[model samples]
Each structure stands twice: as C-alpha cells, then as structure tokens.
Target: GSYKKIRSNVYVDVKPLSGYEATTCNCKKPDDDTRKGCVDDCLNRMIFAECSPNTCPCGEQCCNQRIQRHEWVQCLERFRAEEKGWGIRTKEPLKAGQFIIEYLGEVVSEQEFRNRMIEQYHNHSDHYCLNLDSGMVIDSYRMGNEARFINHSCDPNCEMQKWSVNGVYRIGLYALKDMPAGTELTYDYNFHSFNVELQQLCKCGFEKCRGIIG
Candidate 1:
C-alpha cells in the first residue's frame, strides 16, 4: 500500500463584476431610448478624446492645451509677479535678441475690446489691444495670458514686435539687451512719451522711472 498512491488537486478564482464596467452595446438594433444613450455616449467619448493631454511644443516649462490654454508646472508666482510689477528676475539667462515669449490670443475689434473690458474690468485691466499698421485691431486685451503677465520696466531688456506668420497675427518679445538667465524679463511700457491722456503710475523700480501708468 505504501508503494502505490495517487493524488489530484484543483484551484479556482473569481473576480467581482464592477458596477462601473464599460458595456458594449449594439446600437444598430436599438430602440429610441437605447439609441439616444448610445449617441450620447459616443459624443462624450469624442469630446474626451479631443481634450486629452498632449505634449506642448513650447520650450517653456508649460503645456499648451488644444483650447489655447497653458499649464505651467513651476515659477507661476514669478510669472504673475513679473506681469504686475517690474524687477522680477528670471531663473535663467537669455541672449540678446532672443525670442522670449509670444502673445497668443484672439484678434478683436476695438468695440468688442471695450465691451469685454467693461464686462470683465477687474480681470481685464492689464491687457491691451493695439491698432496695428494694417488697420486691424490686435486684440490681446482680456485674453493675453502670456502677454498680460509681462511687467513694465523703465530700463527694459526687451521690446514688442508684430509679425504675420502663415496669415496669423503674432506679437513677440525680443530681447533688447544681453539678459542674464536669472534676470526678470521686462519691456518699456513706453507710456510716458505718448501724450494720450495717461493715468497709471509706473510701478517699475528703475532709478529713471517715468512714473507714468498706462
């Protein structure tokens, strides 16, 4: 008996079905109610597909979404401070005539600009819409996410230049002088020289501050 022996064993495992499981539906044979649900689900999936995260081509530490919005992973306070007042330093040095940043926004009419300004005055003060040489108003006011964050400086290191690329209007900040990486990026508000009824104090801390606010 000790020399002859036989044994058998079996194991089974089961997983619980979740209530949130995705279901497969045959929409072609569905009635009105089922078809409506299927159509709605399909539309929702499409929207989510379009909104999925994508890599930003901008070299900055930020991601540009399909909706033309940016997500900055760092230096947000520095960015905001630089937009409000001058003298905020950069984390890295930039070369002379380098492309610092871009002003990307919708082109708006002066009337539309005023309307939006009045509508969102509290959040629209820092933005401006310029009447370009082409007679088209370059509307950055109320929607210039990148440009609105740029602070004014008397001894500025950069200047704004407008260029048309691929039939699109673009305004770029070009370095006017050799800027150290950690130096804060700034441009001359150039508001004082204009005799057009200025009413804003220059918060720029340069010794040669014009004290003009635009």
Candidate 2:
C-alpha cells in the first residue's frame, strides 16, 4: 500500500492495515470526457457494489474504474470550525466523481464493536464506526486516517460507496460534486446511534439541515 501525493500543502500520516495486501482492477479510464466521474447522475446513488475482480492491463491506482488500494490524490487538509469542532477541508479543487479516501479502522464484529462503543462513550474516546454489508463494522475511533474528520452535511459534496477488495467488502468515500479549495469535506453521517441525544441534534449548518444525525 502507498500514499500517492495529494497536495503540496496537505499532508497525511497513514499506513495500510497490518498484513493487508492491495490489488487493482483491470479497467481503463473512459476516453470520452463527458461522463468522467458522475456527470449528470444522482450523487447519493449506490454505484459501486460487490463484484468479481477482473484482471486487465492498467494502473489500478490511476484508473477510475477500479478501486486502487492506498491510491491517494493530492490537496486535502483538516481544520477547525465553529460548532463543527475539528473537520476535514480541501486544500485543492476536488472534482466530482473522484475517489476521495477510504473509511478505515479495525474491522470488528458487531458484538465486539458494541462492547467497545460502550467503553468508548464512557471514556470519551473518539469513537467512529460504519456498518458494512458483511455483518461487521469498521471502527475508526482509534485507527482511522483523515477520512474520519469529514463532517456530516444535509447536502453533501461527497458520498460513500461500498466496494469489495480481495472478496472483502470495504467502504469508499467519493466526491459528489466539484468541491472548491478550503471547502469542508462532508457527507451524510447516517448515524444510527442507540442514544437519543446522539442522533437527534443537527449541527451541520446546511439550509436543508437534517436536524438530526439519525
């Protein structure tokens, strides 16, 4: 796994999960520029899904048709914001339909994740988790990279897509629109916290605010 340079001003401290191997899909970039990423489509639609991997002659990292493991882009940063606390922002223009980053963490079973959640909440740890298709969860509270700092937005500029790597399900966050520099990175958190207070308050500041995280 490698961290491709994202930007001059942006920096990241990330490492591939231990013992994990990355592979590329045999796909080519579209020659036509009209539909480069997500030209005129629903930004929130589920396009990436579990599929059989194909072997082709292409740079899995540079090609858009496949998931390039540890394939990073340039020009992303994290910064502080009022009400939002610490958050992720862009240092360079991020095009629509571009692969942003992976939501990473320790892949744990729901039960184990549940126990850890209780412990995390009580201890006031930075706990973050995402539900997966395989009855498991990706816990990033302690092991995530920069993707964890992305805030929640009612009208988000990015969206999460589920992809499979080596026959395992993984989460891929992508840009949904042409995001400008210094813009805060965001997506619908879609939190389903069991606690009422955790999901009922909205702080994203969107005009069409969800008013709740759940």
Candidate 3:
C-alpha cells in the first residue's frame, strides 16, 4: 500500500534485516499454454524461461533459453523531473495494472537501515529505501532498476505492490491506470514517519496534492 487505505497507509515498525536471491529475471514462471514459436517469430511477449524442473518441447531454442531473464526490461526511460530531479517515463505505452518495474535494492534490517540513514544524509536518502515486510526493508540507494527514479504524486497513476516469488516477497511497481507514452511514471510513496517534518516536501504538483511525502 503506497498511500493511505482511503489514500493513506503506514508501515508498521516491523522487524528487520531482509535479503533475498532476487535475480535471474524470473518472477514465478512463464506462460505454458501460449507457446507459439521457439526463439524467433514468437507471438507471446511474456518471456518465460523454463530454466529448470519443467522440461519444455523446445530443448534449447526456447525464447526462455535465449532470454536473459532479467535483461528483458526495456520499456521505460529516465525523465528530468525538475525540482524532483530525475524521474522515470515509459519508453512505450503500458497497459493498466501492468507490471512496470521492480524496486530492487540491498535488503537490510530496520536497525541497520535506520543507522544507514543516520550515517548518510539527503544526498543518499533520495529514494534510498522502502519497507518490504516484517522487520525488513530494501535500500535502493545503491543498486536497482529505473523504478528508483519514479517520484511521488498525490494523484499518482501508479502504485507499489508486494509480489512473491518462490515464497520470497519483493516490491514491485504497477500501473494504476492506462497511461500514455511520455507520461511521467509516478506512484504514491506513503513514506513512513521516519524523517517526516524534516523533508516532507511534495513537489508533485498534482491539483489535489497532499503536499507532503506521506
């Protein structure tokens, strides 16, 4: 939940120290019924690599084999969000409720995360962290995809959702509505009351903007 339940929600001060093997560009699995081609002339866009366990008809030529699991994301680009600094935009049009991007980062404990924030400042605190589950948070201040650049908007067109892969939970960005190309990618960052008053400035400029980075 990015914003409050009615539009505002809070991250319970859960436990901490979360990590995972969120790699391989593989989230769950690919479509087994819509296999139209092997490698080329494939009609399906969901590039699923039945890498292990499940044996497919195409021994090696399967698009899954050719695909580099995580390297398939090329839909969005960066946008200079002015006062908000850098932002993200779609390279092409995306469907509503589409899985846009992942908020990958170093999963750490809440204590360590808080210590990191205390040690660092706004310089590294831009979009540095996000809470995942009990006691665990993801710090994207270092490594991540384009999802880190997405700014917060009170009237956002996107929202953050927790996704599970192999029982491990992960943060994923989803489009809340059908947005056009060149549309800035934004989501409600119902940021916790960590450093609220210090930097709760919301420059998203939405007409009904909440004014703070809640």
Candidate 4:
C-alpha cells in the first residue's frame, strides 16, 4: 500500500519522550443515570486530567475524551491569511470553552528541545515549540497537524489549554468566546522563549496588536 498523504511536512502523533507518567483517576459513575459518567465534578477533570477508557472507572460511558476522539475535526477549514501566510477558520459557530484542536507533535526532553532549536530550527523565522508543564517541549515546526497554521492574536478568540490525556500531557486549543462561522481562530502566541533578534513583527492586524509576536 502507498503511504498516507499529509498536509504538513510530516505527520506525527502525541508521543511524549520523557519518562514521566500521569496518574490515572478512579472517578465514580453518577448514580441517578441523569448524568452518565465523569461529570463536571469528576476528580480527574478537576485536575485537567482526561479519563481514558482503560483507566477511568466510567469506561465506555466516559465523556471527557475530547482529545482522544478529536471531536472538532470536521468543524474547521483551512484558509490563506491575507498577510499572515496560512490560517484556520471555524466552519460553524462555536461556543465558549468548546474544544477545538489538539496541538500534536513530538514531545522531547528540555535538553533535546534546546539541541533541536539550535540545530534544526537555527535559521527559521517562526518557531513552533510549546513548553510543557513537565519541562519538556513540543516542536511542531516540521511535523504537526492543521492546528500549526493557527496564527497569533493580541486579542484572541481562542486559548491554548494544557490537559492530561491517557497519561500524556497535550495542548488543546479552545474557544474563548462565542464566535460565528467564518471567524478565524487564533490564540495568544505569548512567545516568551525567543531572543529579541528572533522575535518577529506581529501582523495580527488587531488595533491593539502587540507589534511584535514575541
């Protein structure tokens, strides 16, 4: 069989290279059946931990598997930004807090990330390294999904949230407010790891655009 075609330079799954592991939750299923499983008060959800079928007590009834099932896949469409190069837009209106997309890529140790930043992305104008809570980093420059095309906004309509899924830490983009269809999706770039020389001029075009993305 021929290999699968991907939209990016390479396709990669969320693979954490670090030795750390997430603690599984044992949240109980709701008794009344009015709420099937893992509701808002779920111990796991409180910690930003998503319950996996294999580890969650609710099993097939678990409802916190947004990242695992990729619920927002068909809700987005890719587009060309007028000046920002590439961008993504919502196909339908989205409500606040709705999960949008998971930022998938190779998660590596901090030391390895530094090496790659200095070697592989030395001359790159844009960097896609997202720092993880565990001190590792997710580099999506060469291998990532459609979410990588999302540009930054000083006043964004979406936000990047970190959640634990199946013992792995992952980044999920979510809506910050109700937005109509055709609205472009964006999140604060908050580029804090770059040197002044590497900071690119922000072209987000918002009246309050920070002028620099970094």
Model 3, position 213, has a per-residue lDDT of 84
Candidate 2: minimum summed lDDT over ten consecutive residues — where? 7-16
* Candidates arranged by TM-score, highest first: 4, 2, 3, 1
Candidate 1 lDDT score at position 81: 54
RMSD of 2: 7.9
Which candidate should be chosen as best, given lDDT against the real structure?
4
TM-score of 1: 0.51
Candidate 3 lDDT, 63-106, residue by residue in tens:
43322234224678876778988888887787786666566666
Off by over 4 Å in 3: 1-72, 122-125, 191-198
lDDT computed for candidate 2: 0.58
Which candidate, 3 or 4, would have the higher TM-score against the true structure? 4
All candidates' lDDT scores?
A: 0.43, 0.58, 0.57, 0.70
Better of 3 and 4 by lDDT: 4
Q: What is the lDDT of residue 40 in candidate 3?
A: 40
Give candidate 4's TM-score.
0.78
> What is the number of residue pairs that collide in model 4?
0
In order of lDDT, best first, we have 4, 2, 3, 1
User: What lDDT score goes with residue 10 in model 1?
Assistant: 12
TM-score versus the correct structure, for each prediction: 0.51, 0.70, 0.66, 0.78
lDDT of 2 by residue, 76-145 (tens): 7778878877888989898888888777666676566667766664554233666664446666665667
Please write out the lDDT profile of model 4 over residues 70-168, one tens digit for every residue.
Answer: 665577888888988778998889999888878766666666766776777678766676666555666676666777778888889998887877666
Worst 10 residues of 4 by lDDT: 1-10
